[PDB]
Symmetry: C4
Subunit: 38 residues, 4 copies
C-alpha cells in the first residue's frame, strides 16, 4: 500500500544497474569518450 | 503526507534525467571536461 | 518492519559506497579504462 | 515509520551533490584521471 516506496526500490535498482551496465557493453566507454572528444 | 518519501522519488527522477541529459546534448561531455580543466 | 524501506536504505548506502570504491580500489580507474579499451 | 528513510534522503541528496561538485570544483577530473594513470 505504498507505490511511492515501491517506486524508490525499483528506481534504485534500475538506477544503479542501469549505470554500471550502460558503462559495460562492448565499446560504449570508448564510443562516448571519443565522440565527446571531437 | 510524506515529504520524505516524495523527496526520495523526486530526487531519483531528477537524478536520472540530469545524469543522462547532462551527459549527452550539445557535446556536453566536452563542456564539462573543459570546464574542470579551466 | 519494512523490508521495502530497509531495502531502499541498503540500496542507497551500497550505491554511494560502490561508486566511490569502484572508482578507486587499486586504481580500478586504469583497470576499467584498459579493459574497455579492448 | 522509517527513520532509515531519512538516512536515504540525506545520502541521496548528498550523493548527487558529491557527484556534481566532485566533477567540477578545482580540476578534480584531472586529479582522479592523473591519479589512476600514475
Amino acid at each position: 500500500s505504498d507505490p511511492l516506496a515501491v517506486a524508490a526500490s525499483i528506481i534504485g535498482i534500475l538506477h544503479l544497474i542501469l549505470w554500471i551496465l550502460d558503462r559495460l557493453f562492448f565499446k560504449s566507454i570508448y564510443r562516448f569518450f571519443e565522440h565527446g572528444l571531437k
